[PDB]
Amino acid sequence: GIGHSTGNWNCDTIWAENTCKTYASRHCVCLMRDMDQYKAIGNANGQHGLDTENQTQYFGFSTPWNYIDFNQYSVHFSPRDWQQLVNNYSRWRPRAVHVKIFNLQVIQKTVTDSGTQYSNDLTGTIQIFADQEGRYPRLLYPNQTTLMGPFPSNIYYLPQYAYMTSMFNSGGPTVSSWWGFPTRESAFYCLDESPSQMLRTGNEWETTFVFPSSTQWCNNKISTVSITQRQNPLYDTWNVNGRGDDAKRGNFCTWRSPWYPGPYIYLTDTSAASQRLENLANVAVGPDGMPLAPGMPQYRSESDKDEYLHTFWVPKKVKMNEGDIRNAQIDVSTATKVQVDTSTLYNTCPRSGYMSTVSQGGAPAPIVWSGCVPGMIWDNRPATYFDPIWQQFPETDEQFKIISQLGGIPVKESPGHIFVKVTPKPTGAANGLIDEYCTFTCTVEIEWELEPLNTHRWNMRSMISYETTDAKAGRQIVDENGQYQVNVNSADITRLYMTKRAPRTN
Amino acid sequence: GIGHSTGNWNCDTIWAENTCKTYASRHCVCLMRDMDQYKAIGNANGQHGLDTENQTQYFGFSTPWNYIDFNQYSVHFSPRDWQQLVNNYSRWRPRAVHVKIFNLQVIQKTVTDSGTQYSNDLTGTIQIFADQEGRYPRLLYPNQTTLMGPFPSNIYYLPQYAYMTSMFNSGGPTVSSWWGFPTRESAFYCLDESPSQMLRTGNEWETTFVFPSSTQWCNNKISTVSITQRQNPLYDTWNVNGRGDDAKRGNFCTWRSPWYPGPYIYLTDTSAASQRLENLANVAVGPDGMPLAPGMPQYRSESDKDEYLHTFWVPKKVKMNEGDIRNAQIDVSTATKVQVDTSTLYNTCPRSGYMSTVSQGGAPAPIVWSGCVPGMIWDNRPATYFDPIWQQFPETDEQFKIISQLGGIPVKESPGHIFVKVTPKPTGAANGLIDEYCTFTCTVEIEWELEPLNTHRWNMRSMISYETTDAKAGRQIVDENGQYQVNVNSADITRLYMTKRAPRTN
Amino acid sequence: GIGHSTGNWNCDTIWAENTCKTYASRHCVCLMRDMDQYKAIGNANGQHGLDTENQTQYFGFSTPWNYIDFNQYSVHFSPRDWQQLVNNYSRWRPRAVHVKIFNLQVIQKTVTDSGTQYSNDLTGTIQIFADQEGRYPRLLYPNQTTLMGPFPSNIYYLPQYAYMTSMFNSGGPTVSSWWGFPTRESAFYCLDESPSQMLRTGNEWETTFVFPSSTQWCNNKISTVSITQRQNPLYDTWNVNGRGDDAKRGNFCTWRSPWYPGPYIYLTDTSAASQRLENLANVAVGPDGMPLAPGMPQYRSESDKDEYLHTFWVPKKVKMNEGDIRNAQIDVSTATKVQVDTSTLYNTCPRSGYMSTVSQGGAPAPIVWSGCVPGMIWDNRPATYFDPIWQQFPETDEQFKIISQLGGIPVKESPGHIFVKVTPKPTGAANGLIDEYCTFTCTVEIEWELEPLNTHRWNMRSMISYETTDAKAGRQIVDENGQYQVNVNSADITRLYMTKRAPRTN
Amino acid sequence: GIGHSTGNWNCDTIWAENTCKTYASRHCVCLMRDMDQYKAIGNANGQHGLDTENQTQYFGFSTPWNYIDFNQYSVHFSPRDWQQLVNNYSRWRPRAVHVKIFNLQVIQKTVTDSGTQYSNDLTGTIQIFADQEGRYPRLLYPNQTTLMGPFPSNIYYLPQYAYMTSMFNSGGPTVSSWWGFPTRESAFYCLDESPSQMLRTGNEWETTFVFPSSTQWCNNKISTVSITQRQNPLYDTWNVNGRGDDAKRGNFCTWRSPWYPGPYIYLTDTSAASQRLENLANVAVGPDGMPLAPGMPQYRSESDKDEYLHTFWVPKKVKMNEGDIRNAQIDVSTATKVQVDTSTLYNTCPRSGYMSTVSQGGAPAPIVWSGCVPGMIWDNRPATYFDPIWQQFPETDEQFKIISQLGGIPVKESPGHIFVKVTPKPTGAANGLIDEYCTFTCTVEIEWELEPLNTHRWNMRSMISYETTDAKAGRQIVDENGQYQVNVNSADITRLYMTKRAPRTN
Ligand SMILES: [Mg+2]
Ligand SMILES: [Mg+2]
Ligand SMILES: [Mg+2]
Ligand SMILES: [Mg+2]
Ligand SMILES: [Mg+2]
Ligand SMILES: [Mg+2]
Ligand SMILES: [Mg+2]
Ligand SMILES: [Mg+2]
């Protein structure tokens, strides 16, 4: 009946030898969206202006549905879980994802002369279905504010599910209306067409996703030797140097290499005002295009250059109940700009671009774009505790070495969206519904496959170490006001939240 | 006891239908290294000057241990073995590697008023362990002087095992000390930490390595038709020419191609004095960088251009007992500079760079870097009898089409180093050891998987043929002084030692 | 469903021969704490001023969770239960602790123009977990106001769980901020990370703790002979007196003793105003320190000296519903200062300090600190009905004869905290929750192992006896206003509530 | 026969879940001692002068025998082994000790006009016996130079076994002869009276010791809360403050404590010249006495005060072959004075001495000696990588809480000495022996029982982390000269080599 709990809270992380199982429980608010209406959404302005909102053209639909987005490490791992993971394991990948929705409460809001009264709707339902068929558009973009909070007691407002569809603008960037955008390929999806479980309070819901065995790993390995220095220092080579002459002793950089470092793309960083996407390094795709930053993983000496480094905001502090952040922009003052530095890429990755000329005898010049040629080896950018766990990629005919420089394990199969909405309860009058929302507990269980790191080096290795400065800074703890304070800067991510800690000998 | 041999000499090559088994026996000297001390080694100078020694910065360790390096074809194949291999087989790969160490003799050297006396230390031991776990740094660089000699009676001095580790120079290229180089990732490896067999005379040792079935093949196939000429000459095509017009009869080069040749990188060759790595076509990686030569396999008409051709020294003659060559540079006058020409790449490989412009209607210009695009097909550089058999690559997150332009079958798993050192026998006094070294016989057995070549062409095919000029030049024979004389020039490698002899019909 | 009770009220005490089982049922209020937020708490002022609040520096966290603290005798025993226990048994210890939580009611509070309305939230949950792993900080301090009331009908407000963590102050006692205090060892604990049962009304919860068999006993034995007088009075000894001379008849104090009394520490009592911890007998530990009172158990003739006597407040009266006492100081006028006198220690314990000199022939002087030397025997301070049952001690490397002079059976394993919180029910708006709290019945069952006292003395023994003065004083009964009135003074504890009643013959 | 090795080199460390097995192999030199003579040894001077040699009086015997001393962590663990141990495990203890002696070589030294010639004595024997019965005096003193070197390739010269016996000096400290010292209790032990294995080359020897299950653990736990702060910060206590008054809110230091910190002894540090033992804090025992430093474990703010901190020399660098160090004093310039700081004792240990007075109302004064009183809890000093593994204590009637402030797990049963000597081979002439010594390989295998650390704190914990400064300093690596360079200072031991890293929650 209505008096028995349908599930239990678990945020724990359970470590086994080669596996860990993470539990993420959140108290979840499912708000009714747009009076249970699908709405066509769009933006007519295509000027692609940086620093100014609504400059890309799109056509899409916001659904009345909400969905659950747990894809980040900070959701499923406590900071010491992350410390244990990155310090002790050379790689890891998610295996099974189990999501439970339980302890449903549909709450009727009623407005009275005094405040809003909250009453249980005992027979109220919510509708839940997991879309694992790819029946509906997947929202692929990482680290969007749709995510659960890192802290267990963060109230999670399920984001409203909305998607963009194929548009075509015959007009310019300044077109006033976006109703010229829809194309015959533009697809409206009614999620109400899908079969969905209806749940009263006392009903529970669960779904399982299993990652394929082909799922790639998040690699924690760092190379302890330059790929250029793999020769024996005490011996000459029969190979010649770069220009074909004698390879000198102890001058190894001049020796011809059996391999190349990874590809390299020169990217620019502009500080100027009123710059468009076309002022950045970019490529035009479909309606708009994309910038090329951060680009190919490459060692950078500097801690701040944002065009070559994966750069993202992390919230300084996290309020427990932030409310619904739909259509809300992250306040700049509440976050910090952090850049994941490539210092861990020093041994395996190009420090500069490939330098060559077509002119015979000409001085080698930097090559804007060096695509993958046979014999390239490179390491990926380090993951962070704030990165997505996986990155689903769009279905295309052809992929090459799929990786997101933004983060996540590139996957061709990922947990589908779990769509939730409060069943509309109409008042019997036109254009009206009984005001109500759902609260429930969602536990996300992730099976993790771990590979413990193995190093026979004599000397000690670096570890992620929580320090007194970290505690005085208030990292990974709550403040006096109840806010879980991340308090992260780029140097803090190097020292705490980066992967590629595990020294690799080969 | 001490009076029975622990093994037998075998240098033979045994041919089966799809397999050959090579035996390489060498009389092996294991010298004590640095009084059984691990030493930190390094070079402070980073100016990367070509033509001048000690211009790359490195930090590493020389171990007291010695290791066995057999990775070259000339070690395991006689010249006629190579002739039989390259003439009769379209491809080959190593399968199992078996190494025997037997007939150990620990020899005590004692200095007397008259000369040095040599006595057996009958209870002296050597320590041997194969590192197949990748526990210790692998020395990946091909054709380093650590190799066994091509001739069976060459005395093989086991090279001292030394490696370079991650360094970081905050200073410039001119820094005086290399003790600023070590980093927290820099790993000292004590090989004495590994379990190792101790062997007296009368003990034998063996290890087996099996290449994975995923091991790539050394390909002996040459294309007998240009990839551009694969159309039927007698018929028109419905396809258009390059600019979209009628495809004319018997003008096939102008027809649009179903495929592209391989990637192309323009490289420069500089003859100037006092040139650094940065004057060559190159890329910066970690502490130093690498030159880009020879680059992508591409047909070259000329016999000598060293920047596009795999170029290496081959010794003119090989002394049977050369002594320990540790820290010795190959004498320029004792070797010859040979360049493996790409004439066998004529049909499958780009003869020039890709020629295109961004400017509409502009004249096509050479493209410095053409990375792999979908639809590229190409052939690898031909292997030589003097190439490594395999090339292990560094462990990285990501590889693309691993190949060494220097040679060898690119492998992700290769025989690990077999480490050998004389057990230190101390005198009972500080800083002193009984002077002693080990002689033993090492047999390296390699199983080879062969694919016999199949050609139905009516006319005869080219063969590697030993000629009277080869005999008068003294190739593949000893001279009057007992030196096995290779006497090779670039033309000699084309005619004798190159692969890609097997005509491929498709 | 919601219409069936999940448990029954039991406060009874059931006596068996060697065992009693106590039941403590309380009507329990679980209040939501700090809007379900973990808050960092601390005090910056370290002046350690007596008589003034907030003079110790600490850093810690208050959790949204509540916990159950039943550790006191007056909770589990009625006064006659205590009378029966102390009169009839030489010792007792707790064996099993069983806690039931049942008849849950989540009550929504709503504010209206007229008063606050209280409605059942029928699907509301609370979260409960017992932490028996020591996963979370145990609150070790005895007789803190977190306790249940002595009387069955006392409404028990579960205390908010909060803990202090390692701090380090580089500043002085006057530092303005406590955010300098956290250290790398300072640990924030999220109790929401633990798996916890969610319970609706109609769910019940229970946990069991079993004390180890190694659990010490609360000893009710008093010695009926001085440890100094254990000789036969009618006979001389061959032993000498204290200075080595003849041991005289009937002068036994001068005879050398086979044993010593317990250790002795001189403590001071200061009445002066504006005294700090450093004016008291004390020791500095970590951030602050501790006073040394009451110190080692020692006979005191006087009824009031608080530095040598276990001293604590007992409430004069106990209101049935006192409300939530979080952050509330006991009102001085509502309690009485009672001192447990050591009169029962007269025979076994030092009446003064050890008196000796280093100077040969010098007059013996009192020794400030006499630590345990071989041959010391002593009795513990008597327990009271108002003492804790057990005292858990902090985990340390080394313990010596663990005992709390404050009370309780020293234990290395005790019932863990049972953490309870109302599941936050959000309003769907930022920073807000439906105002609600839980009422439930908690029964604490304790198995007690008893040892009946055995005395063969001819004459009667003293007993705890309720007297007409006790009834006229209103002890152990309610007053006319419904308050359960303890009405205890030091003399009242000697006569009624002390242990060590059981005469021990040996 | 003589041509087969009797064992294999293993220095490896093998980690299992709850166990690790360490292998320590050393090349071991057994030198003939004193021409196979037992000699009476002694020192007549008893002035106990600090800073001057031979100031203690002793009588004893040096035996012709050598023994094996492996008792230190740095012998059996590589630095990363130590890092893995201290970072991942809350405690550890040794379980079984297995010692192998194999690959024996008896070497005859012969003097010739040119140098010394070294020849195998093939039929030469050494004598080995393990004394596990306690038949012979155990050398109990920790960290004496008799130890094996930390690095695997350190040549280990077995120390000559010598012991001191009961002496009594009726004279003064200035007596000229020590032949007055022997007493009827003074015991000469002939180790040649024991049965011992004789081994030729081709014989191997092994012994096993199993630690009792009662063996204590090396504790890696640090407390994350002060033992003074274990109360709930949000609640008042019924307990009174130190002087018996109201316990104020947030002033916890003034509350009476359920426990005391550990014992405290005030120690002095004198810098003056020509000071004797009697100028230091000390106690006279038997012939001489002992100083009291470092004393009871107590938190010290300062990094350098040597009287309260465990203080010892660590060698800056370690030569591989140092020769025989018998009767050799550590060169001051070759070591560093390091002090293990008590910062990890901050929460559990007294920061100052107990402060009290006998005078009523008198100001509390520091108490020179506070011995253990009931209710004391404390933590031990942290172990270091350079500490002994165990400390055997002398057999006595009575022990109290045996611990060495110098280090090691206090044990009543430890591996006995393995005594080795070269069998004297006489020349057939009076007072002469064929000059010979033995080299052999000794492997010491230790089974370790591990307890993995378990912490549920939300935030990260501190870790031992090898840093770039550590690598630039050359720690845990060899230098360019082949010396294994420890390069340790007090701050380096805090950060790298100390135990008590594992945060303990309770
Ligand atoms: Mg050239
Ligand atoms: Mg050279
Ligand atoms: Mg055209
Ligand atoms: Mg045509
Ligand atoms: Mg006398
Ligand atoms: Mg008498
Ligand atoms: Mg007082
Ligand atoms: Mg108070």
How many other C-beta atoms can be found within 10 angstroms of the C-beta atom of residue C375? 10
* Torsional class of B12: left (φ above 0), alpha (ψ -120 to 50), beta (otherwise): beta
Q: Enter the tokens of residue C310.
A: 């276990």
Q: Which residue of A has its CA nearest to B67?
A: A232
Q: Is B164 in contact with A233 (Cβ distance < 8 A)?
A: yes
Distance CA C237, CA C234 (A): 10
Q: How far apart are CA D393 and CA D395, in angstroms?
A: 6
- Phi then psi for residue A88, to 5 deg, are -105, -5
C-beta neighbour count of B24 within 10 angstroms: 25
Contacts of C125 (CB under 8 A, 6+ apart): A5, A103, C106, C198, C199, C200, C422, C423
Tokens of D312: 């010892």
- CB contact at 8 A, A458 and D476: yes
DSSP conformation letters of D279-334: GSSEE--TTS-EE--S-S----SSS--TTTSEEEEEESEE-S-----TT-PPPGGG
User: How many whole angstroms separate alpha carbon B277 and alpha carbon B268?
Assistant: 12
Cα separation, D263 vs D283, whole angstroms: 17
Please name which of A157, A150, A146, A155 lies closest in space to residue A477, comparing C-alpha atoms: A150
Chain A residues lying within 8 Å of C202, measured CB to CB? 1, 3-4
String of b and e for B73-95 (b: at least 16 CB within 10 Å)? bbbbbbbebbbbbbbebbbbbbb
Written as six digits, the tokens of A190 are: 């009614």
How many interchain CB pairs under 8 A, A with C? 177
**How far is A393 from A384, CA to CA, in rounded Å?**
19
Closest by Cα among C72, C76, C71 to C152? C76
Q: What helix, strand, coil percent values describe chain A, rounded to 5? A: 10, 35, 60
* Interface test with chain A among C192, C203, C421, by most A beta carbons within 10 Å: C192
Chains C and D touch (3+ CB pairs under 8 A): yes
In angstroms, the CA D96 to CA D448 distance is: 7
* DSSP bridge partners of C290: C283
State the pairing for strand pair C221-223/C58-67: unpaired
Q: How many CB atoms lie within 10 A of CB C403?
A: 25
With CB atoms and an 8 Å threshold, state whether B404 touches A374. no
Structure tokens at C387: 């003492």
- A58-67 and A126-130 as β-strands: parallel, antiparallel, unpaired? unpaired
Closest-CA residue of D relative to B187 is D477
Q: Which two tokens stand for residue A172?
A: 């310019």
CB pair distance less than 8 Å for C62 and D223: no
Q: What is the 3-state secondary structure (H, E, C) of C321-365?
A: CCCCCCCCCCCHHHEEEEEECCHHHCCCCCCCCCEECCCCCCCCE
- As given in the structure block, the two tokens for residue D420 are 């080795």
Question: What are the structure tokens assigned to C15, written together?
Answer: 């006596």
Say how many CA atoms lie within 13 Å of D328 toward its Cβ: 15
Long-range Cβ contact pairs of D288-293 (< 8 A, separation 24 or more): D288/D46, D288/D48, D288/D56, D288/D57, D289/D48, D292/D265, D292/D267, D293/D267, D293/D269
What is the Cα C210 distance to its own chain's centre? Answer: 19
Q: For residue C144, give the nearest of D232, D257, D373 by CB distance.
A: D232
Select from A49, A44, A56 the least CA-distant residue to A182: A44
Residue B132's Cβ-count burial label (10 Å; 0-12, 13-18, 19+) is middle
Q: Are C51 and C27 in contact (CB under 8 A)?
A: no
Alpha carbon B156 to its chain's center: 17
DSSP string, D139-194: ---TT-TTBPPSSTT--EEPPEEEEEE-B--SS-TT-S-STT-B-TT-----GGGS
CA A243, CA A255: separation in Å to the nearest integer? 9
How far is it, in rounded angstroms, from Cα D103 to Cα C56? 66
- How far, in Å, CA of D415 to CA of D24, rounded? 15
DSSP character string of D220-244: -EEESS-TT--S-TTS-BSB-BTTS
Contacts of A319 in chain C (CB under 8 A): 430-431
Residue D463 to residue A87, Cβ atoms within 8 A: yes
Q: Do D113 and B433 touch, CB atoms closer than 8 A?
A: no
Q: What is the DSSP letter of B496?
A: I
State whether residue B51 is helix, strand or coil. coil
Angle made by CA atoms D259, D263, D264, in degrees to the nearest 5: 130
> Could you give the CA distance from residue C324 to residue C439 in angstroms, rounded to a whole number?
13
Tell me if A464 and D464 make a contact (CB, 8 A cut-off). no
For residue B280, what are the β-bridge partners? none
Identify the three-state secondary structure at position A297.
coil
- Among C221, C290, C278, which residue's Cα sits nearest to residue C498? C221
Whole-angstrom Cα distance, residue D124 to residue D103?
13
Backbone angles phi, psi at A209, to 5 degrees: -125, 135
Distance D240 CA to ligand 7 centre (A): 9
Instruction: Produce one character per residue of B152-164: b if its CB has 16 or more CB atoms within 10 Å, e if not.
Output: bebbbbbbbbbbb
Write out chain D residues lying below 8 Å of A461, CB-based: 80, 83, 465-466
With a CB cutoff of 8 Å and minimum separation 6, the contacts of C502 are C86, C89, C90, C91, C220, C221, C222, C453, C455
CA pair distance B157, B153, nearest whole angstrom? 12
Q: Which residue of A has its CA nearest to C436?
A: A118
Chain D residues within an 8 Å CB radius of A475: 459
Determine the distance separating the centroid of ligand 7 and the alpha carbon of C315, expressed in angstroms: 19
Which tokens is C24 given? 């403590």
Q: Which residue has the tokens 């390929």?
A: A185
Give the residues across from D100 on adjacent strands.
D206, D443
From A70's Cα to the closest Cα of chain B, the distance in A is 26
Please list every residue in chain B whose beta carbon sits closer than 8 Å to the beta carbon of residue A262. 398
Q: Compute how many other C-beta atoms are within 10 angstroms of the C-beta atom of residue A185.
A: 9
Instruction: Write out the two tokens for A160.
Output: 């409203």
Test B425 with D105 for CB contact under 8 angstroms: yes
Distance from CA of B89 to the nearest CA of D (A): 44
| Secondary structure element (H or E) that encloses residue D472, with its range | helix D468-472
Give the contacts of D315 (CB within 8 A, at least 6 positions apart). D330, D334, D335, D486
Largest CA distance in chain B: 92
- The contacts of residue D184 (CB under 8 Å, 6+ apart) are none
Write b or e for each residue in A103-134: b if 16 or more Cβ atoms lie within 10 A of its Cβ, otherwise e: bbbbbbbeeeeeeebbbbbeebbbbbbbbeee
Dihedral (Cα; C275, C276, C279, C282), 10-degree rounding:
150
Structural tokens at position C175: 């530092």
Q: Three-class SS string for B439-489?
A: EEEEEEEEEEEEEECCCCCCCCCCCCCCCHHHHHCCCCEECCCCCEECCCC
For residue C422, what are its two tokens?
């109302």
The answer to whether the peptide bond before residue A388 is cis (omega within 30 degrees of 0) is: no
In degrees, rounded to 5, the angle at the alpha carbon of residue B42 between the alpha carbons of residues B38 and B44 is 155
Q: What residues in C contact A1, CB-CB < 8 Å?
A: 1-2, 202
Query: Resolution of the deposited coordinates, in angstroms?
Result: 2.3
- Which residue from D minimizes the CA distance to B135? D12
* Nearest residue in A to C184, CA atom: A468
With contact defined as 3+ CB pairs under 8 Å, the chains touching B are: A, D
Sheet holding D355-356, edge to edge: C290-291, C282-283, D355-356, D365-366
- Specify whether the CB–CB gap between A11 and C194 falls below 8 A: yes
Instruction: Name A407's bridge partners.
Output: none
Say if residue A366 is preceded by a cis peptide, omega within 30 of 0.
no
- CA end-to-end distance (rounded Å), chain A: 61
Calculate how far, in angstroms, residue B378's C-alpha sits from the geometric centre of ligand 3: 28
Structure tokens at D311: 């203080």
> Is B213:D24 a contact under the CB 8 Å cutoff?
no
Which tokens go with B444? 């390296």
CB atoms D372 and C372 under 8 Å: yes
CA atoms C397, C399, C402, C405: torsion sign:
negative
Q: Which two three-digit tokens encode residue B283?
A: 């890329």
Q: How far, in Å, are A98, A475, A488, C127, D466 from residue A312 at the CA level?
A: 28, 18, 11, 36, 29
Distance (Å) of CA B124 to CA B130, B419, D104, D320: 20, 17, 9, 19
Query: Distance, CA C332 to ligand 7 centroid (Å)?
Result: 15
Q: Are D44 and D55 in contact (CB under 8 A)?
A: no
* DSSP-assigned letter for residue B147: B
Q: Which DSSP letter does residue B191 get?
A: G
CA of C332 to the centre of ligand 8 (A): 8
Q: What does the angle CA A365 – CA A369 – CA A374 come to, to the nearest 5 degrees?
A: 100
β-pairing verdict for D376-378 and C398-400: antiparallel
Task: For chain D, give the longest Cα–Cα distance.
Answer: 92
- Per-residue tokens: A471: 């505690």
The candidate with the shortest Cα–Cα distance to A211, out of A404, A446, A451, is A446
CB contact under 8 A, B373 and A371: yes
* Distance between CA atoms of residues D326 and D307, nearest Å: 28
Q: How far apart are CA C392 and CA C403, in angstroms?
A: 10
CA distances for B29 relative to B157, B420, B441, D103, D347, angstroms? 5, 10, 9, 22, 61
Q: Which residue of A has its CA nearest to C198?
A: A8
Which residues of A are less than 8 Å from B287 in CB distance?
Answer: 226, 228-229, 253
Nearest-ligand number for the alpha carbon of C243: 5
Paired sense of beta strands C418-422 and C477-478, if any = unpaired
Q: Whole-angstrom Cα distance, residue B29 to residue B44?
A: 32
Cα C243 to chain centroid distance, Å, stands at 44
CA distance B24 to B20: 13
Residues of C in contact with D371 (CB under 8 A): 263, 369-373
